[PDB]
């Protein structure tokens, strides 16, 4: 029998696939990390999986004692919450208020209670009240997705080794959107580790390529452009930096759905789109680029529908 | 190297997970087939690779010559539109209008075309226009999810081998919702040869008991009861029919994202309700009951909050 005890066991372990009909010109092969095939549709059930279990074990945390706190307005909410659910914790999730109505609704699915903040005052605002109700709440724990180093460990222990197995030891170099930072540092440094000839390609918008030497500023792209260098990041992993506009992300996207029967997140389109750049470098003939595509399109096309309407 | 050639090779193939905290007072064992962890989020991934391939095989279809066409308003057109997008057919959904917006623009994203029937006239006018666009379209194809056999085909050479290796063939029962019947079916008909004292039970909605000699009517539970008997559906193999309140399978797919960090369909909800009851037969103690969660649950929470607003 391989039934699964519960839905911790059914994160990671998600397929390669090659794009077929968006790689023309391309001399290199391009092959896809499906993190939409994750049990909530987002590489983030990866690290609310390996955040909670971190805590856990170093005895920071118990079910039905510990709260736990995270200011997070993206699938870093989606992930904690389906974790908690199964775990049994109490979560509660601070994100500014006219942030998508759909992704608060799947968090109240999961019973996360939800602190809305001014959404004048942006990220800060919410990471500054999860600070207030953590001051106020005896035994809770803020996750720190973007300085808990169980972010990249988790990479580290199953993206990476993942990727390295499934592409029978071919790739030549990963294509990561750069959220966190967490998946390049963890899957980045294990990959390194096998091959240190693997060339590792962060991925930024153009509105906000801070790694670059941009000034922070707004952009259409979810989960990558934090406008900051996260502690969990190693930028001396990095061999290069690709921006990619919102408009070309978004073109991409659409792209790979009509094209792959692929629908992907903004982001994923942005990691695509400096994959297939990459692979049409004539200097990377006969090489094998993988590009992480970190979410489901779904929630994009919902949220903006919302947007929208 | 594992690197799948295209989205069709990732279809099936999709985990059981016991439930643990929705089964108190249960003398079986209760496992659910994640049908959510499809690449498209439901069961009707199988059957859109199933009807389009089989219709290849026999000649009927050419890629960038026929023209796919099927009434349908729910996961059939979406299982459909990705494998069409892959392979490079054009696809023409027939639904009645007024269907949720959401769904509508998953289609687009693939690149089905939509044609709007008159909402009065329900699904019955929308199988009417799929039959006047194949009669004026030369070379077109409706897939007749009701009456194709390649529909119960892919669940008895996936869906129904899946449950028997992943139980270690220990499943005594299989609880599946009737939509066209498919699955129940073909699964069912695989796992009777496998073991012919496993005893299979349909879900059907309280409110369209037709199996149950019942009138069709109205129901919430999206994806079963259809109303009539299906052509795929062999009453026969079946040895009891389940009824579930719309009611009750909102609430039981509330406490499975509550409780199991399972976020399902309302479908998924009956065909726990379901398996629960039957689980609590004291005639079942020391059973494996299996019950088939055809879809993942963001889908509906998204249709609800557009129909609501």
Redesign the interface.
Known sequence: ???????T??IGNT????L??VVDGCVARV?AK?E??E???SVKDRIGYSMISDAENKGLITPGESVLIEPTSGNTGIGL??????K?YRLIICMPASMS??RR??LR???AELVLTDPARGMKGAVQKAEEIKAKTPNSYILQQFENPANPKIHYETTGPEIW????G?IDALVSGIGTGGTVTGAGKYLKEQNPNIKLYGVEPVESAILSGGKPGPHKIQGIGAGFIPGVLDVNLLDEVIQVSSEESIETA?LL???????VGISSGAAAAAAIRIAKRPENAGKLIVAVFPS????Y??TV??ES?
């Open positions: 029998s391989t039934i699964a005890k519960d839905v066991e059914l397929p390669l696939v090659y077929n009909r092959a499906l939409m095939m049990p909530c549709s919450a389906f974790i908690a659910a199964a049994g109505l759909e609704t799947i699915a999961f019973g197995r499934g592409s029978g071919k659409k759905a009509l094209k792959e029967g692929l629908l489901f399109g779904e929630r096309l919902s529908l919302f309407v």
